[PDB]
Design a protein around this nucleic acid. Structure first.
Lengths: 117, 79, 137, 58, 94
RNA sequence: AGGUAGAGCACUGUUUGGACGAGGGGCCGGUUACCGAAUUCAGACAAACUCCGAAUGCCAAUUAAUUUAACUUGGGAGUC
RNA sequence: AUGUGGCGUUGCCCAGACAACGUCGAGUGACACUGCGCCGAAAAUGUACCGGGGCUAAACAUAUUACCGAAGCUGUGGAUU
RNA sequence: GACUGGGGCGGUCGCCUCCUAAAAGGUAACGGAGGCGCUCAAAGGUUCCCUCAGAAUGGUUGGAAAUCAUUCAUAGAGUGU
RNA sequence: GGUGACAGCAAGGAGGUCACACCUGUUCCCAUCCGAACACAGAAGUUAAGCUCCUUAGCGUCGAUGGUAUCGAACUUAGUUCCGCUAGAGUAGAACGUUGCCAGGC
């Protein structure tokens, strides 16, 4: 009876997503990788409406050389749409994962970019 | 003549609801006295170390339902 | 001589006798029975005597299903002593029967033979009886 | 649409709730009257103490 | 199998019901397919004559008011003391 | 807001009849019924069992009707 | 307990069912939920519970009406607030 | 010393939890049941992770079972008092 | 696919490198008797499983209509009447999710 990881992910998210949310002055962004690609989708949960989005499967950034530079660029590219609106205090929801490796690189790129987390 | 073994008890605490649904309360008002969490905190509601529920703003109280059986109390701002 | 092996508390309140049989009042394990029409406290001793009467009558041809058990204990107090020194000590076990409850139930005998065997035990027992059959219709 | 309530029994021996309902109807002593508009608020107070009063549609 | 059955007129109280349930009648109901709610009273010695040979599960062709419906015995109440039926329940299966 | 009456056994304890084979056991290691616990289809009970729950009573809010009280601060008591 | 009261079905049916060792003719005998009874129930000054007299209704019931009945309410005059 | 179904003898006297207590709170008796007069520099804080007694399954001595893996296994685990 | 508002458990049926999983790994950051877990590096082959499409109501979830009592009032001292509010069982019946805001692709 071998188990799968994303059910545990969803449990972790539901379980430590209890005290964290956005308020349209303090938005939150989360993160999600499965095995080859990276997603990210910011939301203000009072309204549950999507604002910005940044993906490693997107056309304009389609490269294979490293799995770290894609996290770096997807970060520094959501920062573009951020410094157009809503570039003050935001929260970085870590989905259901540790803080190690790709998630760290994404947070670093999103951080030294013009944001407040 | 005889010997009665029983005869003990403690002082009753005055637990339960303290404010009424629909009633305007003040900031830092005690809405429910309880051992435990028979009713959970909600929006602009806190809990103290005695498991005491209390308000955090000046509004109106509503008792509501949390999940499938769990219950909660909230305070909503505009009077 | 029927009584619980062990009971949680020992000095329990005195049950009710107003209302009607909450349940258990249809003969569904034999073929002929007998059921009460007033309320009373049928005790260990008189259940004992009433089954004595019926096993002593059928000479172990049939059988009796005792649909009553003395679950509750009652107490008494030393012989006519003064009031107010705690509750007294246990004295017997009882079972409250309301109008309707099937008290005794026999099977595997002549309908006649039951018709008098259940008549005999009615006298030993402090509740007025009535003889019934397996239900149809 | 108009009622005429008269107190045909005494309040002695009754509970306080019934005596308070009798006071709100405006009836003071035994056999005294009042003329009021028919209204569910009036009719609930009639129903509470109906064993005490007589009503007639004027 | 043509059980003659009357309809219970609107809003029987508990007193009105319990006093009709002394002359000998018995309350009832039908429900199910192609049918709606109705409150009815059925005769008793007739009913027992019917269900002493037809079997507990079986057909009935009782006439309810203006048309006839084929129903089967489903439910009952039957207080034990002073044996007399309290409620009999029919389902218009169609 | 809340667990009383009633009811209900799903949990804790009581329950009577009716149940199933591995096994200590019958023996000359075994059979097998038989002793005990277990699970099992089968059904009554509770102030200190409940999840399924009233009528009333409680708090309150009101452009929802009749009514005449209510509260605060002082003088004077009696009552236990 | 065969005291009696209906609604009841019913086994044997006036081909002659219960008796008398064939006479005999009108129902037979059973089995129950309910109504009034039944015995059930046996202390000390003096009848002794309608309170008394007495009553077969002047008992108990139901359905209408009449009347009597308080310092309650209404009339009439007065007082104090 | 007091309480006390007269007094004496006997028992008790402060605090905590539950029934009685009649679905808000409160509520008595010499009514029915148990606890306390502490313990822990972690059994406190905060960031992570992580999740069953029992049964069934088999398993080198197997006090049967502790130690070993698999099917469960509703939390029945467990939480210092 | 992601997040986000008020129906399950399983059981036969099928369908595909667009999804995401199944896998290749010890090679690296991670990382524990064990790369069984967790990491990261593959992307060869792939719906066999998870995912995923009715689905069976069999298990489960809701839930009628009838109406089986307890405030009030008399009668009475043994529970009977007139009221008003109606349960828990239990029948029928539904029911194998309504579906909020974006990517991609329509």
């Amino acid at each position: 009876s071998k188990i799968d990881k994303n059910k545990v992910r969803l449990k972790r998210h539901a379980r430590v997503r209890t005290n964290l949310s956005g308020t349209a002055e303090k938005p939150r962004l989360n993160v999600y990788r499965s095995n080859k690609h990276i997603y990210a989708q910011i939301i203000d949960d009072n309204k549950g409406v999507t604002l910005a989005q940044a993906s490693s499967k997107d056309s304009d950034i389609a490269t294979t050389a490293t799995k770290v530079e894609l996290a770096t660029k997807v970060g520094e590219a959501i920062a573009k749409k951020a410094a157009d609106k809503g570039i003050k205090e935001i929260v970085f929801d870590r989905g259901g994962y540790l803080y190690h490796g790709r998630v760290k690189a994404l947070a670093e790129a999103a951080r030294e970019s013009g944001l407040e987390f | 003549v005889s010997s009665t073994k029983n005869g003990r008890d403690s002082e009753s605490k005055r637990l339960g609801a303290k404010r009424a649904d629909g009633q305007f309360v003040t900031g830092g008002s005690i809405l429910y006295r309880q051992r435990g969490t028979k009713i959970y905190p909600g929006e602009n509601v806190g809990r103290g170390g005695d498991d005491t529920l209390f308000a955090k703003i000046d509004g109106v109280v509503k008792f509501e339902r949390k999940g499938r059986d769990k219950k909660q109390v909230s305070v909503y701002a505009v009077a | 001589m029927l009584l619980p092996k062990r009971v949680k508390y020992r000095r329990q309140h005195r049950p009710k006798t107003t209302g009607r049989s909450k349940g258990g009042n249809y003969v569904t394990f034999g073929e002929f029975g007998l059921q009460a029409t007033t309320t009373s406290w049928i005790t260990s001793r008189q259940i004992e005597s009433a089954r004595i009467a019926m096993t002593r009558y059928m000479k172990r041809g049939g059988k009796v299903w005792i649909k009553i058990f003395p679950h509750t204990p009652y107490t008494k107090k030393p012989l006519e002593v003064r009031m107010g020194a705690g509750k007294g000590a246990v004295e017997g076990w009882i079972a409250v029967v309301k109008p309707g409850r099937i008290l005794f139930e026999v099977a595997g005998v002549s309908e006649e033979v039951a018709r008098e065997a259940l008549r005999l035990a009615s006298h030993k027992l402090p509740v007025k009886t009535k003889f019934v059959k397996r239900e149809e219709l | 649409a108009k009622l005429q309530i008269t107190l045909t029994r005494s309040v002695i021996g009754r509970p306080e709730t019934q005596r308070k309902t009798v006071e709100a109807l405006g009836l003071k002593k035994t056999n005294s009257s009042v003329v009021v508009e028919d209204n569910p608020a009036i009719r609930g107070q009639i129903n509470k103490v109906k064993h005490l009063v007589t009503v007639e549609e004027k | 199998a043509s059980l003659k059955s009357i309809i219970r007129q609107g809003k029987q109280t508990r007193s009105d019901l319990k006093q009709l349930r002394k002359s000998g009648k018995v309350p009832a109901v039908v429900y199910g397919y192609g049918t709606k709610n109705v409150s009815v009273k059925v005769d008793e010695v007739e009913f027992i004559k019917v269900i002493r040979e037809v079997g507990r599960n079986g057909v009935i062709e009782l006439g309810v008011g203006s048309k006839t419906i084929k129903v089967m015995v489903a439910d009952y109440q039957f207080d034990p003391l002073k044996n007399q039926i309290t409620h009999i329940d029919f389902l218009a299966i169609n």
